[PDB]
Design goal:
The structure is cut from a larger assembly and holds 7 protein chains of 7 kinds.
Chain B: H1 23-49, H2 62-67, H3 70-87
Helix pairs in contact in B: 1-3
Chain D: H1 33-59, H2 75-82, H3 84-103, H4 127-130, H5 133-162, H6 168-173
Helix pairs in contact in D: 1-5, 2-3
Chain E: H1 2-5, H2 48-65
Classes of the chains: A mainly beta (about 60), B mainly alpha (about 90), C mainly alpha (about 150), D mainly alpha (about 180), E mainly alpha (about 70), F mainly alpha (about 80), G mainly alpha (about 170).
Bound molecules: chlorophyll A (CLA) (8 copies) and ligand A86 (2 copies).
One chlorophyll A binds near residues 47, 69 and 75 of chain C.
C-alpha cells in the first residue's frame, strides 16, 4: 500500500523512472490531484530525484 | 472474420469447397498428387540425361509439366487435411 | 465379441480368438477389420472355386484354351495383357466408386460391414438371415486358409 | 531404482531440463521436458537398431538378394541407387510414422501435448494389458537404459572412424 | 503453325552459328525462341533469342498471377 | 592456427574482463556511496574479483540457468 | 435416408429437388462443389455431346455438304479435324463459339452470385417448353436424359472408331 517509507514501482509511461522502484516519502490527504511524493536514487535528464504521483500510478513492491 | 485463436484454424479458412471435404479424402489426394509430381521429375530427369535426342528442348513434355504442379497442391492438401481433422470433420 | 458376431470355432462352439488383443489396442478400427475380413473371405471363396473349374473347362477362345494355358496358375502371366487388365480396371473402379464410399458410411454408423445391397435375395426372418451371415463368415475363413 | 548410478538423483549437470524456465528472454525457444523426453526415446530406439545393423553387417550377414556394399558408412547410397524402389517404399513408411507421431499428439515443445512421451501406439502384442504395472515400468526403464547405451556406442563408432585411437577397447577387438 | 499444333520445338531449331556476324546474314539462323545460355561470340552480349524466350516466360507467369484477387466476378 | 585457436584466446580473455567488470559493478552497487567507488576504485576488492574470472564460462552458465543473469521486463522502457 | 439408386448408401441431399436426381452421387461431389456449377456443367456437356455425336455419325454416313473443299475429300469423321483446321472451318466456328461462351461466363458468374438465372437457362426457345410446370419439367428431363446418353454415345463412337478403324456400325 502507498504509505510513508513504502517502496513502489512507477506506472506513468512518461516518467523517467517508469518500471522502476522508488520510496514514498509522504502522501497528502487534502484531495490534491497527485498526493504521493516518491523519491528516487537516480536523477532524471533534468537533474531531479523526486516527483509527485497519484496512487493508481504506483504499485507497491515487496 | 478469418481471425482465429487457439491451436487450430477454423474450416472457413480452407475456402468455400475444401471446407466441406473430409480429412481422409484430402489426405488421399495429397499423397496421390505428390506421387505424380515425383514421378514426373524422375521421368523428366531421364530425358534430360539421355544422350542427345533432346535437342531443341524435346525433353519438355506437356503432361509432365502439368504433373509437376501437383507438388504445390500436395502441400496445400496435406495442410488442409490436418485442419479438417482437428476441426472434427 | 459382444458387439460383433464370429468368435465361434469351425465346429460351432464358442471360441473367442484374439490372442494379440488387436481389437482392444486398435478398437476404433474394428469396423474396418470386419469389412476386410468379409472382403478377404468372399474373394478367397471365389478364388478357391474357379481354380477347380479352370481345370475342368475353359471359355471359348484360343487364349483360354487348355493348350494355351496348361497350368491354371500360369494364366496370370500368360493373359496379363488383354484379360487381367480388363479385370483390373473394373475391380479398381468398383473400389473407388463403391467400396470407398461404403466404408466411409460404415465408419459413421450407417452401414453394416459387408452390406452392398444384395439383401433383396435374402430371407426375411432375422434368425435365418443371421445364420446365413455366419455361414458366410465361417466359409470365408475356411476358404482363405484353403487358398493358402 | 532411479539413477542408481547417480545415487538416486537426477543427472542434469548442465541444466538443459530447466532452460524452458528461463524467464528473462527467448520465449518458447527452449524445449519443454516433454519434447526432450520424446527425443531421448527416439534417439535411443534408432541408435539401437543402427548398432545392431552395423554389427550384423560387419559380422558378415547379408540378406538374400540385397544391395552389396562393404563400408557401413557408404551403404545407404548404394541401396538408394541399387534398389531405388525398395528405398522409396521404406522412406515413405518411415515418413508417415514420423509425422503420425506428432500430427495427432500435439505440440510437445511448448508442453501442450497429450501423448505420453514414448507411445507410438505400437503395442501390437497387447502387453500393456497382459502384464503387471511393475513389469511394464521395468521394461520402460530397460528400454531407456539400453537405448542410452546404444547411443554411446554409436558415438564410439563415429569417434573411432573420425578420431584415430579415440576408442581403445574396440581397437583391441580388432575393429578398424 | 507450330505454335497452335503444339510442336513448339521448331522455333528453337537452327540457332545462329558461332560464326555469325551481327547485323548481317553470314552464319545466321532461324530460331526465335531458345535457351542457349551465354553470350553471342562477336557482340559479347546475351543472345536475342534467349531474351525473347525470357520475356515470353515471364509474361505467362505474371498473367497467371494476375488472376488471384476477387474483382466483381 | 590461423583463426580458430587464436580466436579462443580472445574469447577467454574478453569474457574474463567483462565478467569481472560486471561483478565489481554489481558488488559496489550496494555500498554506502555506489558512485564514489566507480571513480575511485577499491583496489583490494577489485583484485579479488579480477582473479575470480578464470572460470567465467562456468559461472555464467550457472547464472543463466538460475535466472540471475537476464532480467524480466522490470526495466525502464520508452514511452511507445 | 438411403438413395434410390444406391440403396446401401446415404442420399445426397444438396441434389434434392433437381431435375434428373436419381440419388446417384457415390463420391459425393455435390457435398463439396457448388451445385449450380455442377448442374450447368452437366447440361452443357450433354448438349455439346448430343450435337457432337450427331455430327460424327452424319459425316460417317456421307452427308458432306456441297461444294466441299478438295482437302476435305476422303476424310472420315475421325481424321477430319486437322484437314478442317487447315482450311479454316474450325477457326471460323471457334470465333462464334467463343463469343457465346464468354457472355455465358458472365451469366454463370451472376447465377452463382445469386441473380435468378437457372443453371443452363439462356432464354432460348422457351415457347416450346409447355405451360404447366409439370410439362416444363418433363421437357427438361427429356433433354437431360437424352444428353446423358449422348455423352456416353459419343465416347463409344470415337474410341471404337479410332481403335479398330471402323465405319458407322460400331463406329
Ligand atoms: C512410393 C515410394 C517411393 C518414394 C517415397 C520415392 C521417393 C523418391 N524416389 Mg523413387 N521409386 C519408387 C518408389 C518411391 N520413390 C519405385 C517403386 C521405383 C521403381 C524402381 C522408384 C524409382 C526411382 C528412381 C529410378 C529414382 C527415384 C528417385 C526418388 C527420389 C526423387 C525425389 C524427387 O526428385 O522429387 C522431387 C519432387 C518434389 C516434389 C520435391 C518435394 C518432395 C520431397 C521434398 C521429396 C522427397 C519425397 C518424400 C521423401 C516422400 C516421402 C514422404 C511423403 C509422405 C511426403 C525420391 C527420394 C530418384 C532419385 O533421386 O534417386 C537418387 C531416381 O533417380 N525413384
Ligand atoms: C508455413 C507456411 C504456411 C502455413 C502453415 C499457412 C497456413 C494457412 N494459409 Mg498460407 N501462405 C503462406 C504460408 C503458410 N500459410 C505463404 C508463404 C503464402 C504466400 C505468400 C501463403 C498464401 C496464402 C493464401 C493466398 C491463402 C492462405 C491460406 C491459409 C490458411 C488455409 C490453408 C489452406 O487452405 O491451404 C490449402 C490450399 C490449397 C489446397 C491450394 C493450393 C494452391 C497451391 C499452393 C498453388 C492457413 C491458415 C488461405 C486462407 O487463410 O484463407 C483466407 C488463403 O486463401 N495462404
Ligand atoms: C509458346 C511459345 C514457346 C516456345 C516455342 C518455347 C520454346 C521452348 N521452351 Mg518455353 N516457355 C514459353 C513459351 C515457349 N517456349 C512460355 C510462355 C513459358 C512460361 C510458362 C515457357 C517456359 C519454359 C520452361 C520453364 C522451359 C521452356 C523450355 C523450352 C524449350 C523446349 C520446350 C519446347 O520447345 O516446348 C515444349 C512444349 C510443348 C511441346 C508443349 C507444352 C504445352 C504446355 C505444357 C501447355 C524451347 C526453347 C525448356 C528448356 O529447354 O529450357 C531449359 C524449359 O525448361 N520454356
Ligand atoms: C477371384 C476369382 C477369379 C479370378 C481372378 C479368375 C481369373 C481368370 N479366370 Mg476364372 N473363374 C472363376 C474365378 C476367377 N477367375 C470362377 C469362380 C469360375 C467359375 C466357377 C471361373 C471360370 C473360368 C473359366 C471357365 C475360364 C476362366 C479363365 C480365367 C482367366 C481368364 C480371364 C477370366 O476371368 O476368364 C473368364 C472367367 C469367367 C467368365 C468366370 C466368371 C466370373 C466369376 C465366376 C464371377 C465374378 C463375380 C462378378 C462377375 C463380379 C463382377 C463385378 C465387377 C464389376 C467387379 C483368368 C486368369 C479362363 C482361362 O483362360 O483360364 C485359364 C477360362 O477359360 N475362369
Ligand atoms: C538404423 C537402422 C538401419 C539402417 C538404416 C540400415 C540400413 C541398411 N542395411 Mg541394415 N540392419 C539393421 C538396421 C539398419 N540397417 C539391423 C538392426 C540389422 C540386424 C537385423 C541389419 C541387418 C542388415 C543386413 C544383414 C543387411 C543390411 C543391409 C542394409 C542396407 C540395405 C537396406 C537393408 O537391407 O535393410 C536392412 C534390413 C532391416 C534393417 C530390417 C530387416 C528385418 C542399408 C544401408 C543390407 C546391405 O546393404 O548389406 C551391406 C544387408 O545385407 N542390414
Ligand atoms: C512449411 C512446410 C510445412 C508445413 C507448414 C507442414 C505442416 C504440416 N505437416 Mg508436413 N511436411 C512437409 C512440410 C510442411 N508440413 C515436408 C517438406 C514433408 C516431407 C515431404 C512433410 C511431411 C509430413 C508428414 C509425413 C506428415 C506431415 C503432417 C503435417 C501436419 C501436422 C503438423 C506437423 O508438424 O506434422 C501440418 C499441417 C502430418 C499430417 O497431418 O499429415 C497431413 C503428417 O503425418 N507432414
Ligand atoms: C488410415 C490408417 C490409419 C488411421 C486411421 C490411423 C489413425 C491414428 N493413428 Mg496412425 N499410422 C498409420 C495409419 C493410420 N493411423 C500408418 C500407416 C502408420 C505408420 C506406418 C501410423 C503410425 C502412427 C503412429 C506412430 C501413431 C499413430 C497414431 C494414431 C491415432 C492418434 C489415430 C487414431 C498415434 C497413436 O496411437 O497415439 C498413441 C501415434 O502415435 N499412427
Ligand atoms: C460439336 C459439333 C460439331 C463440330 C465440332 C463439327 C465439326 C465439323 N463438321 Mg459437323 N455436324 C454437326 C456438329 C458438329 N460438326 C451436326 C450436329 C451435324 C448435323 C447437321 C453436322 C453435319 C455436318 C456435315 C453434313 C458436314 C460437317 C462437316 C464438319 C467439318 C467441317 C465444318 C463444317 O463445315 O461444318 C458444317 C456443319 C454443319 C453444316 C452443321 C449443320 C448446322 C448446325 C447443325 C447448326 C448449328 C447450331 C448453332 C448455330 C468439321 C470437322 C463437314 C465436313 O467437312 O465433313 C467432312 C460436312 O460436310 N458436319
Ligand atoms: C430459336 C429456336 O427456338 O430454335 C429451337 C429449335 C429446336 C429444334 C426446336 C430446339 C431444339 C432442340 C434440339 C436441337 C434437339 C436436338 C437434340 C439432339 C440432337 C439429340 C440427340 C441425341 C443423341 C443421342 C441420344 C445419341 C444416341 C446414340 C446412342 C444411344 C448409341 O448407342 C449410338 C451407338 O453408337 C453407339 C455409341 C455404339 C455403336 O456401336 C452403336 C450405336 C450406333 C447405336 C430448340 C432448343 O428449342 C431451339
Ligand atoms: C501457383 C501457381 O502458379 O499455380 C498455377 C499454375 C498454372 C499452370 C498457371 C495453372 C494453370 C492453368 C492450367 C490448367 C495449367 C495446366 C497446364 C498447362 C501449362 C496448360 C494447360 C493445358 C495444356 C494442354 C491441355 C496441352 C496441350 C498440348 C497439346 C494438345 C499437344 O501436346 C500437341 C502435341 O501433341 C501433338 C498433337 C503432337 C506431339 O508430337 C506434339 C505435342 C505433344 C506438343 C494453375 C494450375 O491453374 C495454377
Amino acid at each position: 500500500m502507498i504509505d510513508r517509507n513504502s517502496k513502489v514501482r512507477i506506472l506513468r509511461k512518461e516518467s523517467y523512472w517508469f518500471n522502476q522502484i522508488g520510496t514514498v516519502a509522504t502522501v497528502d490527504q487534502s484531495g490534491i490531484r497527485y498526493p504521493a511524493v516518491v523519491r528516487f536514487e537516480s536523477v532524471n535528464y533534468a537533474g531531479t530525484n523526486t516527483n509527485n504521483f497519484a496512487l493508481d500510478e504506483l504499485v507497491e513492491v515487496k | 472474420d478469418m481471425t482465429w485463436e487457439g491451436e487450430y484454424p477454423p474450416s472457413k479458412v480452407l475456402g468455400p469447397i475444401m471446407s466441406k471435404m473430409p480429412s481422409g479424402l484430402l489426405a488421399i489426394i495429397s499423397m496421390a498428387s505428390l506421387g505424380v509430381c515425383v514421378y514426373s521429375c524422375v521421368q523428366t530427369g531421364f530425358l534430360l540425361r539421355e544422350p542427345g535426342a533432346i535437342e531443341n528442348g524435346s525433353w519438355v513434355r506437356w503432361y509432365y509439366v502439368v504433373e509437376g504442379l501437383g507438388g504445390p497442391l500436395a502441400w496445400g492438401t496435406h495442410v488442409a487435411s490436418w485442419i479438417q481433422r482437428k476441426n472434427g470433420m | 465379441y459382444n458387439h460383433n458376431s464370429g468368435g465361434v470355432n469351425f465346429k460351432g462352439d464358442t471360441f473367442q480368438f484374439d490372442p494379440l488383443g488387436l481389437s482392444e489396442t486398435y478398437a476404433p478400427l474394428v469396423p474396418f477389420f470386419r469389412e476386410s475380413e468379409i472382403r478377404h473371405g468372399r474373394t478367397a471363396m471365389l478364388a478357391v472355386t474357379g481354380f477347380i473349374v479352370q481345370d475342368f473347362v475353359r471359355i471359348p477362345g484360343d487364349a483360354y484354351s487348355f493348350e494355351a494355358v496348361p497350368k491354371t496358375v500360369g494364366a496370370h502371366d500368360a493373359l496379363l495383357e488383354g484379360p487381367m487388365h480388363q479385370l483390373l480396371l473394373w475391380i479398381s473402379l468398383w473400389d473407388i466408386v463403391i467400396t470407398y464410399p461404403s466404408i466411409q458410411a460404415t465408419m459413421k454408423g450407417e452401414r453394416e460391414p459387408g452390406d452392398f445391397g444384395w439383401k433383396w435375395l435374402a430371407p426375411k426372418d432375422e434368425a435365418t438371415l443371421k445364420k446365413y451371415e455366419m455361414n458366410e463368415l465361417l466359409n470365408g475363413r475356411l476358404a482363405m486358409m484353403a487358398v493358402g | 531404482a532411479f539413477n542408481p548410478e547417480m545415487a538416486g538423483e537426477v543427472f542434469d549437470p548442465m541444466g538443459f531440463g530447466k532452460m524452458h524456465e528461463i524467464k528473462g528472454a527467448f520465449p518458447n525457444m527452449f524445449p519443454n521436458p516433454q519434447f526432450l523426453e520424446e527425443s531421448e526415446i527416439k534417439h535411443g530406439r534408432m541408435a539401437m537398431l543402427a548398432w545392431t545393423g552395423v554389427w550384423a553387417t560387419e559380422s558378415g550377414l547379408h540378406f538374400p538378394g540385397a544391395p552389396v556394399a562393404d563400408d557401413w558408412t557408404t551403404a545407404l547410397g548404394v541401396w538408394a541407387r541399387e534398389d531405388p524402389g525398395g528405398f522409396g517404399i521404406v522412406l515413405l513408411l518411415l515418413s508417415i510414422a514420423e509425422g503420425e507421431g506428432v500430427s495427432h499428439a500435439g505440440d510437445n515443445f511448448r508442453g501442450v501435448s497429450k501423448k505420453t512421451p514414448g507411445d507410438m501406439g505400437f503395442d501390437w502384442m497387447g502387453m500393456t494389458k497382459k502384464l503387471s504395472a511393475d513389469k511394464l515400468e521395468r521394461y520402460q526403464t530397460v528400454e531407456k537404459k539400453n537405448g542410452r547405451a546404444a547411443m554411446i556406442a554409436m558415438a564410439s563408432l563415429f569417434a573411432m572412424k573420425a578420431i584415430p585411437g579415440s576408442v581403445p577397447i574396440m581397437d583391441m577387438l580388432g575393429a578398424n | 503453325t507450330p505454335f497452335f499444333t503444339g510442336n513448339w520445338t521448331v522455333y528453337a531449331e537452327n540457332p545462329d552459328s558461332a560464326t555469325h556476324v551481327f547485323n548481317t546474314s553470314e552464319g545466321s539462323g532461324t530460331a526465335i525462341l531458345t535457351f542457349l545460355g551465354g553470350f553471342h561470340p562477336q557482340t559479347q552480349s546475351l543472345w536475342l533469342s534467349d531474351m525473347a524466350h525470357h520475356h515470353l516466360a515471364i509474361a505467362v507467369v505474371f498473367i497467371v498471377a494476375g488472376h488471384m484477387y476477387r474483382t466483381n466476378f | 592456427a590461423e583463426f580458430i585457436l587464436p580466436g579462443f584466446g580472445f574469447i577467454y580473455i574478453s569474457g574474463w574482463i567483462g565478467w569481472v567488470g560486471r561483478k565489481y559493478l554489481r558488488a559496489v552497487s550496494t555500498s554506502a556511496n555506489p558512485s564514489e567507488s566507480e571513480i575511485i576504485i577499491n583496489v583490494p576488492l577489485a583484485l579479488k574479483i579480477m582473479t575470480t574470472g578464470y572460470i567465467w564460462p562456468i559461472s555464467a552458465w550457472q547464472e543463466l540457468i538460475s535466472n540471475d543473469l537476464v532480467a524480466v521486463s522490470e526495466e525502464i522502457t520508452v514511452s511507445p | 435416408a438411403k438413395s434410390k439408386a444406391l440403396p446401401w448408401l446415404p442420399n445426397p441431399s444438396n441434389l434434392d429437388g433437381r431435375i434428373g436426381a436419381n440419388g446417384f452421387d457415390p463420391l459425393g461431389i455435390s457435398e463439396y462443389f457448388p451445385v449450380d456449377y455442377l448442374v450447368e456443367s452437366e447440361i452443357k456437356h450433354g448438349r455439346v455431346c448430343m450435337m457432337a455425336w450427331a455430327g460424327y455419325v452424319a459425316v460417317d454416313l456421307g452427308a458432306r455438304i456441297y461444294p466441299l473443299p478438295e482437302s476435305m475429300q476422303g476424310v472420315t469423321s475421325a481424321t477430319a479435324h486437322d484437314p478442317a483446321v487447315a482450311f479454316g472451318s474450325m477457326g471460323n466456328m471457334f470465333i462464334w463459339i467463343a463469343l457465346f461462351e464468354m457472355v455465358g461466363w458472365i451469366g454463370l458468374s451472376q447465377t452463382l452470385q445469386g441473380s435468378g438465372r437457372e443453371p443452363g437457362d439462356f432464354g432460348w426457345g422457351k415457347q416450346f417448353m409447355g405451360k404447366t410446370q409439370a410439362e416444363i419439367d418433363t421437357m427438361k428431363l427429356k433433354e437431360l436424359t437424352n444428353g446423358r446418353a449422348a455423352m456416353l454415345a459419343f465416347a463409344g463412337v470415337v474410341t471404337q472408331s479410332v481403335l479398330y478403324d471402323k465405319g458407322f456400325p460400331y463406329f
